Amino acid sequence: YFVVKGDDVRQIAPAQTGVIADYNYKLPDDFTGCVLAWNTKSIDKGQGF
Amino acid sequence: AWGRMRISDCVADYSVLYNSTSSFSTFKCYGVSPTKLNDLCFSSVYAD
Ligand SMILES: *[C@@H]1O[C@H](CO)[C@@H](O[C@@H]2O[C@H](CO)[C@@H](O)[C@H](O)[C@H]2NC(C)=O)[C@H](O)[C@H]1NC(C)=O
Numbered sequence: 001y002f003v004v005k006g007d008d009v010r011q012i013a014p015a016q017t018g019v020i021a022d023y024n025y026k027l028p029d030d031f032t033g034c035v036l037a038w039n040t041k042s043i044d045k046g047q048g049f
Numbered sequence: 050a051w052g053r054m055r056i057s058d059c060v061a062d063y064s065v066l067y068n069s070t071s072s073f074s075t076f077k078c079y080g081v082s083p084t085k086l087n088d089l090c091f092s093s094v095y096a097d
Contacts, residue, residue, distance in 0.1 A: 007074055008072070010076075015082060015083075015084055016084075017083040017084055017086075018067075
């Protein structure tokens with residue numbers, strides 16, 4: 001579980017490139033399981049991410 | 050009335066786009082995979 005920005009949500013998937021797929025978190029090419037994502041604007045604020 | 054331009058005699062790494070450039074809402078490749086654009090050389094490239 002983690003918190004990202006919206007444009008980066010598409011990067012949590014096999015075979016992707018970017019800052020959130022090369023230097024921060026990566027998923028194997030044979031990945032079994034599910035991905036869930038929802039907006040949390042009201043509860044997450046500040047500059048602490 | 051859209052433009053077109055040709056890029057030649059240059060080296061291209063996409064990591065430079067990471068620093069200070071805005072993110073990308075749509076980034077979709079068809080004939081190639083995005084994970085293999087740093088290991089290839091192309092005979093010709095055009096930008097629209
Ligand atoms: C990362 O982005 C910063 C944005 O300020 C760049 O800062 C300046 O960038 C110009 C052009 O590259 C340089 O001529 C300046 O010397 C840089 N100044 C600073 C603040 O260092 C920085 O160069 C970029 N670094 C890269 C591209 O990795």
